[PDB]
Amino acid sequence: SMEQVAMELRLTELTRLLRSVLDQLQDKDPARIFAQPVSLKEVPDYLDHIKHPMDFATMRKRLEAQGYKNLHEFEEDFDLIIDNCMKYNARDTVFYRAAVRLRDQGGVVLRQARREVDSIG
Structure with a gap:
């Protein structure tokens, strides 16, 4: 159908808008602490701690x-x-502090992205 093509023309554009937003969020991580998954070779017990790594x-x-x-x-x-x-x-670590900063700086980016998705549909 044509109603599945128009659907995908939206999804494709959501993917296009989300690509931009991810780029901005990731620019708030210049240390690249969140670039890659946590290494299981380097933190073998990590999944004992965190069930849904990202x-x-x-x-x-x-x-x-x-x-x-x-x-x-x-x-x-x-x-x-x-x-x-x-x-x-822990709270007094380079990693916890980088997350807090990422969270603060990503508020702004996400605040405008909520408006652009609502606005453009």
Whole structure:
């Protein structure tokens, strides 16, 4: 059908808008602490701590596979990154402090992305 093509023309554009937003969120991580998944070779017991690991390249695979149906699923993956980090790492660590900054600076980017998805549909 043509009603599945118009559907995909939206999804493709959501994917296009989300690609931009991920780029901005990831620019708030110049240290690249959230670029890659936590290494299981380097933290063998990590899944004993964190059940749903998340990182930017993992969100990227999913993005280019058009696996985000809406902003809300995308936002959930972003909060995983932050929230996992704040649990696994103690408060007086470079990693906990980088998450707090990422969270603060990503508020602004996400605040405008909510308006652009509502606005443009």
